[PDB]
Amino acid sequence: GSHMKWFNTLSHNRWLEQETDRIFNFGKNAVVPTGFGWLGNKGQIKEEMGTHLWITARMLHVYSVAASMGRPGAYDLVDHGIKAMNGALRDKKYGGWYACVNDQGVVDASKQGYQHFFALLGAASAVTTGHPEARKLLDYTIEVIEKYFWSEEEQMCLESWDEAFSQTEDYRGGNANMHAVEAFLIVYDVTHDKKWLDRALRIASVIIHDVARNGDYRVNEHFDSQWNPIRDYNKDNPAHRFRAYGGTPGAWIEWGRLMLHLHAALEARFETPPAWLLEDAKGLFHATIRDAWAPDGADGFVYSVDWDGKPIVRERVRWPIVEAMGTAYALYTLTDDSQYEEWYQKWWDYCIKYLMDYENGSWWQELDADNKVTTKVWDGKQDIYHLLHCLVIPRLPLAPGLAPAVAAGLLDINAK
Amino acid sequence: MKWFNTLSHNRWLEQETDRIFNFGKNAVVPTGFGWLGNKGQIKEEMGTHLWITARMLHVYSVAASMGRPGAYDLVDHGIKAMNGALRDKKYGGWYACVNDQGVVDASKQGYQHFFALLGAASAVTTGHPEARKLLDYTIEVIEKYFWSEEEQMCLESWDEAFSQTEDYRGGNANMHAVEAFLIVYDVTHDKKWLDRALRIASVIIHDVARNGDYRVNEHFDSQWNPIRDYNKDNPAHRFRAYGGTPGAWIEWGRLMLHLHAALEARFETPPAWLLEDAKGLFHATIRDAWAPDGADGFVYSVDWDGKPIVRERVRWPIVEAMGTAYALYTLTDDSQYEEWYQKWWDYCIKYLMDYENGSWWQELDADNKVTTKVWDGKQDIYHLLHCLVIPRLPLAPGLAPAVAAGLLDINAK
Amino acid sequence: HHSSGLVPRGSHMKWFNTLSHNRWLEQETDRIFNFGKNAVVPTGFGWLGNKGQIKEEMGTHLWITARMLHVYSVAASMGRPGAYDLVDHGIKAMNGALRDKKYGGWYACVNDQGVVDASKQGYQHFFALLGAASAVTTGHPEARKLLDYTIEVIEKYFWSEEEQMCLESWDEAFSQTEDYRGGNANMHAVEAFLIVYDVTHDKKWLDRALRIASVIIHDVARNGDYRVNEHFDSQWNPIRDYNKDNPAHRFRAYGGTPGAWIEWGRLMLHLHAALEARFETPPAWLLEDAKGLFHATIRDAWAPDGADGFVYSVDWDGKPIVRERVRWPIVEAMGTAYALYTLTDDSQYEEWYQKWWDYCIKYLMDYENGSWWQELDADNKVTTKVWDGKQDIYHLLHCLVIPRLPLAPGLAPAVAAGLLDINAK
Amino acid sequence: SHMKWFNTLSHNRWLEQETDRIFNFGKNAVVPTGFGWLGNKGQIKEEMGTHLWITARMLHVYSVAASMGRPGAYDLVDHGIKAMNGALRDKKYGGWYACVNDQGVVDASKQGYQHFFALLGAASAVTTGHPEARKLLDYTIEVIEKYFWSEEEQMCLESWDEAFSQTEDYRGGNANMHAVEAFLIVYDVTHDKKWLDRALRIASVIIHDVARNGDYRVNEHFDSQWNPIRDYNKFRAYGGTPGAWIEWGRLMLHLHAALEARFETPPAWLLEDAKGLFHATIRDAWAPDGADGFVYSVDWDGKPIVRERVRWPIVEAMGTAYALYTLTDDSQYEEWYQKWWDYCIKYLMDYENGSWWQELDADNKVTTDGKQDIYHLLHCLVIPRLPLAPGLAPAVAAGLLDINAK
């Protein structure tokens, strides 16, 4: 009919900032002596879940952004995060970080690559605040990543180890490798050591440009030690929180945004990006809508699909649509194609209608196939890190990345 | 009195910038850029110099990003010249000087090769389709012959065939290496270019200059020991003056503040000596070389006691001083730096700016009357961007990248 | 839609919507305004030569007088002292010696002694309409009365309700109309109607503009590979061979005039933008055909003969006939590049704009004698063949002012509404 | 429609570029004793010597140029301050000789109107922060308070002999008007309210009492008891100088704006009388004789006497149009400003020989002593780019150029 304009309007960006403050305030209750706890549906700590590395590292990242946004108390949460990464979570005998601890000791002693890449992101985002211990934490995290999680032999990321780093898992994961790309982008932004961007491009070339593109942009996540897909992985456990059977369309559209951050990093240094970053980001965006948007007679993104693109887990988890909104912004920024803003607007309307929770705080984690609140895949409201991708990313250029851009004063730079 | 970051001052700067861009256009010759005389006509006897051709490529890259019609054509002409008669097809790199008949000076001058690197890196910011290929080639030549991994410093020069390197190491060539490396960093975001820049500055400024009351030693032997008496018999050399060249001291200061700004832009604490030594160089330049002989202006050279030797006021030292005043003001907010900038602007319009014949005079005598002694014509406009465009831009990224990124007047109201 | 003639680029050099480029444009605009001021004569605006002197032998043309009224309306809204006096002079000339007191409308040409050419030229009357509508944006107290009069003349003699198209010309007495229908007159009708719409919001002006474009572009031009047919008989059938014996005509060249093709493109994008400004989805053929015209203009007329520049005319196979580089075609091309960039965000249109700007300063701009050359030979050296002097500055606002403004409302309205550099940083 | 110029960046860019043309013309006036008298080709007329009023005005002009970021301007401020501390300065009796040259004193008289320009020049120079400016202002204030501001009359005196032994048996609107102009800027660089109190008092006597009661025809010539001399001279034209009427209007609006800037309700008569003066100036002096332009003087019936179009009256009219527009938002004031700009480029501006003509005949053709002033031109070139408070030099120094423009 005509173009309703939200992107780069101060009116929309004011609404985003005020929702951002609501989300920052919800996450503050997660402070526990050993790091950040697991928030439930009323913003209370679920003490039985203990202190997870992935949640502690994500909150360190989140409050780095909040601190650069000039929020009192955020810097204290960054300081608390860095103390936790130097304290109870840190394995003093073998190095790196336990997956989960509590006041009594270690709950899960395993060394999870997924969670270590979030440690790297958290440390790199914390660097943007100039916290005096942030750069030392990043340098240590880099040594752990290069010793145990980045393989020079495979030129890809490993998945996990036992406590003692004696045996690595006979498995390679798209999820851990995707969050490696995310962390590497920010490590690049705070080092300009080229190898971080080279590693990110290489990971995307293998998982997206080779495997995903050849399967109609259905991202394969599960691989053996020779980087062959395991198509049947977790067939008996399809609703796994991190390793769902088949395809996780939320992850496809997230890969898209990350490859546009890579594209934008190359353009920021006056370098023509390879054409496949934008072509594949478009392919992933359109595949996500083709297979996973309202495929079953109601609005929303399903959690998982088979290799034919037919839904398996039909629950609407929060993070897939949040990532979709981030990618819509990134594609709009690089194409000026108004279809991407229309999707962003449609998804915002769905989010306030079904996911946003003004009564109990933050957003619901999970809805059923009719978009009614449920508990099946998940349990509580333990994450706010994804929400910055629909609340803060649309206020920033695509280079440098989220925490660096906010710290460089770039919030609303393109808005009038 | 407020000039820095005012649109009124920056409008005056842009209008003078257009006058300078217009003057340089007449330097176009088939083999690159010629040597302009005092009326902006080509001095054909000087032929086509690599340093002038590379500098004009840089200048018209900035002009093109400023939206000036014709500038991009000059960028195109510059890149063709760097792929044409100046390029040594047998041994690689570039001849120092050519003309329409062939090679005039076949030597491989590091000073001039670092300007080739700056020119190629600035040209990349225009997106000219051959710029990146020229930069990649220039990088290979620099890393093969001019950056020494053994010394972690820049060599000076070679014969045509790259068979023997000069038994000499130079502050001047190493300073213009730092200048080029900053822009290579801005168009690669490969930290090794900034690591090299920091290392060069640590040796020439933080070690030697600081220990001599910030009187920069420029002349070294192959083991990086100072030759204090170098060119005693030829004190007014255009590139290697006897003793200290205070214009170079204050220029080193600005370059170290660009390095500082690059490190802060990626959330890295710059070493404290970049700002401390930039201040030391700025104050030493004023102490020894500003009105040291009973009249305003910066002398060309001083002895190791800081007393003038060549008392002629060459154009580029005061232009560089004005750039450094801006950079120090930007990092300190100390209004003494703006006072110096304003005082130097008043001197420049009174004695150096030439509205009748175009551009600025290259050289004045000890009473600030136009002269010919050290120099001959108006062959440079590259230095003028440091007092005309730099004060309109942040210190990171560098000049050509910042203009191309839309940052002109970003801090002004 | 991709044309030959650009080397692909490694990064985006940004000029459009930069205050640095727009400052360069404004300073060139002031140089052009200053050149036109010497054209003031008692009966209107004279014909300026290569040194900015009046060529008195050419007398006072309606088309030049009406164009200068339009130009100084823009200058007046830009806050230039003296411009409003030239608008006042223009309106007095349109109410004085040029005006036919017996039959109405305006003589084509007068001088201090009387009428030189008494004919009633539609081409020139549509410039009278544009001039009056642009003058309205200044609020000159006689402008609205001049527009109302001009509208009456246009609706009586030049817009045909029967054909739903514009007629070409009449004798002095409006007794017989020319056995000819012209793309050129109809194109400048569209241009004028856009501005009449902007100062009336009487829908019929935009309806008439859309209708004219639907016939000359969407029907005839599109079916001939976007080679605009300009010459028609009274039944609107093409006369393909028109002026075969007089191929270098200043207004009615034999075959196709690619400058006019790319100009049609920009006008259709002003029409598109007028519809979007009132929250109405424009028909898709306005943008599709503007792209077709832009790419056809480059295909047939850009550097077809071993040197840069736009040739004046091509035959129906796209073979150049008049190879001289006249000023206005590349100026219009630059305007259309801006309009297409604004609606597509396709950087190929900015690259063409930048390439054409580089050509203009190299070969057309005349800093020594003033303004720009009117005409170059096939090697881009100054010549005299099609034209004679520097009688026009109206086209130059399309590459100097249009790139500083939104596409709606039109040129004079947008400047008067404070929109200069609204999108620039 | 309204054609919009005021507060548009497009118009203000045209104004700044003309301002630079005017700054460049004045630079040739530098002589060792101060600022010389420029002729019609921008050459020094050496026979005219160094006038106090011209030297003080150029000090003011290059203070504005220096705050505008023009290289060379600050050197001219420094030169101006040195001239006010050198040969112009009476070392024996204090204040400044009216005219000197390289050899010595040409006119030793102590002219009030020229001393108030010395005060304006010193106050404008203070806004540059030149280290000798404040000392020059403090000295100038002492001379003004000793000899030119009368605590007894609460008005300004006109002139004295060299030795300050006898004051002239005359009181003038012109000296008192330029006192108001200087006092406004002294207020802006001291925030001592007494300068604004004195300005309001001067205006209350010359405008609110006498001018208002005579249909806003300002009486300029008074005896020592401040009674009008209507017949005087059957700088001191017989009858009314309408240029001065409209100038008084702008100055009272600067006074109004200074009071509003410190949250003080200005008396209603400042705006009412500025409007009265503006409309009286149009009524009697705009195109009163069959051709465009402002005549120089009129009789007490408002009929022209001296029909020459001098440059400064229309320049001041343009300043007042801006000030009235700023306080009323009445577009009639912008229409007058636009009409006067069109007249100025057509008849006064001289692109061939530089600057503007000083004087035209009754048919607006140039007529027959040079182009010795550029100070008035800032009132139509810079004032329309600034708020009405603080005043011209302070506002530019505070970064307020184009603050209201888009």
Ligand SMILES: O=S(=O)(O)C[C@H]1O[C@](O)(CO)[C@@H](O)[C@@H]1O
């Ligand atoms: O954010 S949570 O929803 O609590 C955890 C999810 O983050 C992802 O890696 C998405 O990229 C999922 O695999 C996790 O379940």
Ligand SMILES: O=S(=O)(O)C[C@H]1O[C@](O)(CO)[C@@H](O)[C@@H]1O
């Ligand atoms: O620019 S010129 O004056 O032509 C040359 C000077 O540039 C410098 O390297 C300064 O950075 C001098 O040594 C050259 O003479």
Ligand SMILES: O=S(=O)(O)C[C@H]1O[C@](O)(CO)[C@@H](O)[C@@H]1O
């Ligand atoms: O502007 S001029 O070159 O003098 C006249 C041209 O304008 C056109 O109508 C193009 O739109 C041509 O037909 C005229 O020759």
Ligand SMILES: O=S(=O)(O)C[C@H]1O[C@](O)(CO)[C@@H](O)[C@@H]1O
């Ligand atoms: O500026 S000049 O025209 O040279 C001098 C005039 O200034 C006034 O004081 C106007 O306010 C007049 O009395 C002078 O003649």
